[model samples]
Target: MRIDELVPADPRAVSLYTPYYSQANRRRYLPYALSLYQGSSIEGSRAVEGGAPISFVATWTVTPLPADMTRCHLQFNNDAELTYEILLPNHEFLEYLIDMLMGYQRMQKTDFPGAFYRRLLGYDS
Candidate 1:
């Protein structure tokens, strides 16, 4: 699947650099992006101990947030495993995250894949 198939259509929705807090209670900002990969593992996650194959990966940096945020990352795989090493600043941040994720789900369901592919192939120009 194309990268856009796994993310929001509005570029700003996923690329906006938003400020958030780290587990150590420090401030930082990072832009989030999602992509698809074919495999059983995700990047930025602990070495694949064992799990179902993963196809989607979301990534962002908490760098310069806190000394301990250097290892901050999040991952979710087909195995129903979700892992994170960072902390949101507040409930609003958590809500925003959920909204963003839902936005991707909505887009994926509504977007016409054939139309998208046709545009990419210069048929809808």
Candidate 2:
């Protein structure tokens, strides 16, 4: 499925090897477009090339974990929200954390899934 109210991220920064705390580190994971799915409460992401893609609900309160990890609270019920928080690398977490705080203006979410494709995604007939 495609994002309903997809939003773009801010610009990008270049680098090699995807070093620690580098934009490339995060960019490596989210190289493609992003979708916020406004009103629907779900989200979409490509999460890098050759990997898998997913869509789900998200939370705004993102934080760093103890070591080289970060905690991402998902959207859902009470228990699942607090119990099954996802973890990410320090650099990766930083990218998402900042994006959420910035309300998704980091990169431009291309004019993807336009009218015709939107129909395929079931956005309209």
Candidate 3:
């Protein structure tokens, strides 16, 4: 299923009366995006762990604030299962996100989870 399908039916309604009022108020027509990344896949030459692989899931909420206008908020949930937020001002955010995912995929393929973690700062050890 698509990421948008996973978001709460009305995030804005949920964000109302919250610090994310701006986000809550303009979420009506926003498009949401989500993605997952795994760790073992990042370390190409490393041994696979027996348990769950480290992962990160991100959701982007895009809303139009004005006529032909748009804004985006990104919520990232990592393997440790923590959720964080990022704001996307334009297409550049999408580009950076894609770049980050591609970099992670490359690291997984090359067996460099350590390097990935060190560079990304999601966790230590």
Candidate 4:
């Protein structure tokens, strides 16, 4: 399934976001994306909201914060392309998330659950 089904094609509509808006965050989304890509045997979410599919640049002047926003790409079976702007929120959470990704990287992945979209669509029914 494609997220294009769950969301609209408008960039502005997609960009106006908050955590609860779709509950897209660093911990949940970061590892979820890794596992999905691993299972698909492909290359590699906020990708649902906070990420954009475009070019970029780097501008830095000040010291980095404990947890700042970062962006990257995730794809499905080398099909569609998605980018995510992730904000870890704090130092400890950032460390935990990094470790989680490292652990996911250490092991092979398979049998992923429903999906971020399914939960949003109310899977309990």
Candidate 5:
């Protein structure tokens, strides 16, 4: 998947890393990307949603849990806030996420579906 082209709200929002087996630390997972995305000064994190807002820090680590598998270790305000993570394995979830990104860029919807499908097979459609 072309993360660079797919993350539209901020094409610069997403970051990538080569898998490092030894560097998987709970405290550093996706730190640079999250910090860059949500510019907060609190030591850990603070997030707010709603009129008043719900606030906390969210950080995640994506590392190979096995030679062929990777796990996303996510730390957030609490359980309810992590529902978005529930869709990680669902095909529709990715379709929507990519569609949303492309929509933000005013691209035609047809321009995105094939690319999204190609990701499942690790190839360009």
Candidate 6:
């Protein structure tokens, strides 16, 4: 997919390296390209009906995890989203996460079917 097409409508949304917290104290997992406009942050939507949808402020990069990829960390908006060491069973799962996020973005940007855009991200669903 084109990088320009992958980005959001906001012009200030520039790509940044979003660190994923890892269990290993010494090693750091690779960062992803999370697109966020200055002063913008991301959080889950409220539970009320007609609630605002989840917004995309960043992108997760696809890269080979470290040999000791047992755990990782992820934080957002200066808050600890997931500071604890998290299990990464395999590379497939990691790839799935990236595809899921990208698929979500594609779905938000266009009226395409979820399955179609997901498949474009190499996801069968």
The best candidate by lDDT is: 2
The C-alpha RMSD of each candidate to the native structure, in angstroms, is 15.8, 12.7, 13.1, 16.0, 13.7, 13.0
lDDT of 3 by residue, 51-84 (tens): 5444344334444322222232222233344444
Quote the positional error of residue 21 for candidate 5 in Å.
Answer: 30
Q: Identify the superior model by lDDT, candidate 1 or candidate 2.
A: 2
**Local distance difference test scores for all models:** 0.32, 0.36, 0.33, 0.31, 0.31, 0.31
Q: Report the backbone clash tally of model 5.
A: 8
| Number of the candidate with higher TM-score, 1 or 3 | 3
Candidate 6 structure quality by residue, lDDT tens digits, 20-69: 32324211111222222111322322112365333212222223342233
lDDT of 5 by residue, 14-49 (tens): 323213222343123233323322321221222122
Model 5 local distance difference test score: 0.31
Tens-digit per-residue lDDT, 1-125, candidate 1: 43234433244533332333332211111222212211112332212226533333444443322222222244545343554444334323333333333444455421212332233245645
Of models 3 and 4, which has the larger TM-score? Answer: 3
Write the number of the candidate with greater lDDT, choosing between 1 and 4. Answer: 1
Q: Which of the predicted structures, 2 or 5, would earn the higher TM-score when compared with the native?
A: 2
- In terms of TM-score, how similar is model 4 to the real structure? 0.24
Model 5 poorest ten-residue lDDT run: 40-49
For each candidate, what TM-score against the reference? 0.20, 0.28, 0.29, 0.24, 0.22, 0.29
**Where does the lowest 10-residue lDDT sum fall in candidate 3?**
33-42
Q: In model 5, how large is the Cα lDDT of residue 59? A: 33
Which pairs clash in the backbone of model 1? none
- Stretches off by above 4 angstroms in model 4 are 1-63, 81-96, 99-125
Model 6's alpha-carbon lDDT is: 0.31
What's the distance in Å from true for residue 57, model 6? 8.8
